[PDB]
Amino acid sequence: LVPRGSHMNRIAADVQRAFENAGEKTLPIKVEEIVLGKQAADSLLDYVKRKNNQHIVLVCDANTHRIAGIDLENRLNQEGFQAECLIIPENEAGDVTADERSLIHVLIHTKQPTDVMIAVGSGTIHDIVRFAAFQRDLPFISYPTAPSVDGFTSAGAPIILYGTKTTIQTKAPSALFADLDLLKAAPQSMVAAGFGDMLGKITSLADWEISRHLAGEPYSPAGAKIVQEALAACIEHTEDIAMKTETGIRVLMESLLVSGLVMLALDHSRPASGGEHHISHWIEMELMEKKRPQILHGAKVGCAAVLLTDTYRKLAQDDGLNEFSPSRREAIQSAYQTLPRGEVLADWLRSAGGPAYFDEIGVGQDSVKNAFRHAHTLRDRCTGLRIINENKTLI
């Protein structure tokens, strides 16, 4: 079907191979190339050549312009492309959001000649481009400047509108090119945010087993084992990631990309996003509400899992579980018994170079106990968190 599929996308190729070997139906992956390595601009150029692009837009911001945009744009010009590094400017609080304002700012400075968009940056840039390109019916290329998240390959765009952050569903990148040396160069906080977002998968996978057994939610064995593999390697390499060695950031980014790839293949976020992510969503809402600057997704995710792993460990051994069926008792128990302690999570997060507790990034206890009680209400997901907050005897 595509040799570029089974050639310039060994990651996605092998993910699909796994799902197929466990006899599972999945949506075909619609990312044609995922390159992760040295250069990557070489292969980017090869791809735009192959697809006969010409008028290329590179959506960048203050920072990503500097550390990626100019390099890429100049090399594109030298090869004979109409390239341009278009900038997204900051809001009053020095933040670059996926708000309607930034969306429309991108969606006018891109002119009708333009036949391809390129997200040069991180999750937010990637959302604005993911959305904008979809509404202007153009392919967009993933150029990540940090291994901070698993939502580069995603179809959905968490954009802000009216007065809330909501996830419109759109279309995935046409390709992805990750410069391993640009990633190594990234702030340790961002690398550690990637590690954070991956540590969320300690509790997300379990909440997915709860979801599976209890609420009869879509579940994939092969998927669960894929994200297990990924999570396992990230941990193993916790030191390599800390120091930001080649192996370490390679393993981080490959694991995050595999997370987004399963999410894509299965058409929902359940294996990657559990109670820790829901809490994280609630905190984020509170930070917008307080009118104060946003903090890294992944940082919040690590800080959330560090607590919610203990919450679930306690639930699993609560006498309240005797009100419940033998089936639901043994489901919660068996799903959560293998959870490590909050302290171990925090220890990994520390070693990695990221924050363990929300006071470190300045959330505070107020919004923690607030989020912990209401987060379950954010999305129709049977989590440990819902089992708690919808049961007197566990409240």
Ligand X SMILES: NC(=O)C1=CN([C@@H]2O[C@H](COP(=O)(O)OP(=O)(O)OC[C@H]3O[C@@H](n4cnc5c(N)ncnc54)[C@H](O)[C@@H]3O)[C@@H](O)[C@H]2O)C=CC1
Query: Of the ranges 11-19, 118-126, 237-245, 347-355, which one interacts with ligand X (CB under 6 A)?
Result: 118-126
By the rule CB under 5 A, 127 interacts with Ni ion: no
158 binds, among Ni ion, ligand X, none (CB under 5 to 8 A by kind): ligand X
Query: By CB under 5 A, which span of 34-42, 82-90, 192-200, 367-375 interacts with Ni ion?
Result: 192-200
DSSP state of 29: P
Give every CB contact of residue 387 below 8 A, 6+ residues apart in sequence. Answer: 210, 214, 315, 332, 394
Contact 71, 212 (CB under 8 A): no
Judge whether 123 is annotated as a binding position. Answer: yes
Q: Which of 36, 48, 88, 98 binds ligand X (CB under 6 A)?
A: 98
Of the candidate residues 69, 151, 271, 302, the single one contacting ligand X (CB under 6 A): 151
Given candidates 61, 179, 197, 207, which one binds Ni ion under the rule CB under 5 A?
Answer: 197
Part in contact with ligand X (CB under 6 A); list of ranges 19-27, 116-124, 231-239, 251-259 = 116-124
Q: Which of residues 44-83 bind ligand X (CB under 6 A)?
A: 61, 63-64, 67
With contacts defined by CB under 5 A, how many residues of the chain interact with Ni ion?
Answer: 1
Residue 122 found at the interface with ligand X (CB under 6 A):
yes
> What is the rounded CA–CA span in Å between residue 385 and residue 150?
23
73 binds Ni ion (CB under 5 A): no
The identity of residue 205, as a single letter, is L
Q: Is 240 in the site for Ni ion (CB under 5 A)?
A: no
Q: Taking CB within 5 to 8 Å according to partner kind, which of ligand X, Ni ion, none is near residue 99?
A: none
For residue 148, give the nearest of 268, 64, 217 by alpha carbon.
64
Other CB atoms within 10 Å distance of the CB of residue 365: 10
Q: Which is nearer to ligand X, 55 or 268 (CB)?
A: 268
Options 53-61, 167-175, 189-197, 321-329: segment touching Ni ion (CB under 5 A)? 189-197
- When binding is defined by CB under 6 A, the residue of 9, 26, 142, 154 that contacts ligand X is 154
Nearest to 155 by CA among 168, 138, 139: 168
Number of residues that bind ligand X (CB under 6 A): 24
Distance, CA of 132 to CA of 339 (rounded, Å): 40
219, exposed or middle or buried, with CB in 10 Å at 0-12, 13-18, 19+?
middle
Q: Which two tokens stand for residue 100?
A: 């309607």
Structure-token match 């505070």, residue found: 364
Q: Which is nearer to ligand X, 33 or 179 (CB)?
A: 179
Q: Considering the rule CB under 6 A, would residue 207 count as an interface residue with ligand X?
A: no
Radius of gyration of the chain (CA): 21
Packing angle, helices 275-290 and 365-374, rounded to 10: 130
Q: Within positions 271 to 310, which residues make up the interface with ligand X, using CB under 6 A?
A: 296-297
CA atoms within 13 Å, Cβ hemisphere of 61: 23
Q: Which does 96 bind (CB under 5 to 8 A by kind): ligand X, Ni ion, none?
A: ligand X
Which one of 121, 196, 302, 355 is in contact with ligand X (CB under 6 A)? 121
CB of 87 to ligand X, least distance (A): 11
Q: Does 179 bind Ni ion (CB under 5 A)?
A: no
Q: How far is the CB of 42 from ligand X (least distance, A)?
A: 19
Q: Return the beta strands (E) in the chain as ranges.
A: 33-37, 55-61, 82-88, 116-121, 140-144, 156-161, 164-169, 175-179
Angle between helices 100-109 and 123-135 (to 10 degrees): 60
* Structure-block tokens of residue 8: 């310039």
* 271-306 burial: b if 16+ Cβ within 10 Å, else e: bbbbbbbbbbbbbbbbbbeeeeebbbbbbbbbbbbb
Q: Is 296 helix (H, G, I), strand (E, B) or coil?
A: coil
Task: For residue 148, state whether it binds ligand X (rule: CB under 6 A).
Answer: yes
Closest separation between CB of residue 204 and Ni ion, Å? 9
Question: Does the annotation flag 146 for ligand binding?
Answer: yes
Q: Please, which residue, 197 or 284, has the CB nearer to Ni ion?
A: 197
Q: Which does 124 bind (CB under 5 to 8 A by kind): ligand X, Ni ion, none?
A: ligand X
- Non-local (6+) Cβ contacts of 318 within 8 A are 394
Residues lying near ligand X in the complex (CB under 6 A): 61, 63-64, 67, 96, 98, 121-125, 127, 145-146, 148-149, 151, 154, 156, 158, 186-187, 296-297
Residues lying near Ni ion in the complex (CB under 5 A): 197
Indicate the annotated binding residues.
61, 123-127, 145-148, 150, 154, 197, 277, 281, 297
Indicate the annotated binding residues for substrate.
150, 197, 281
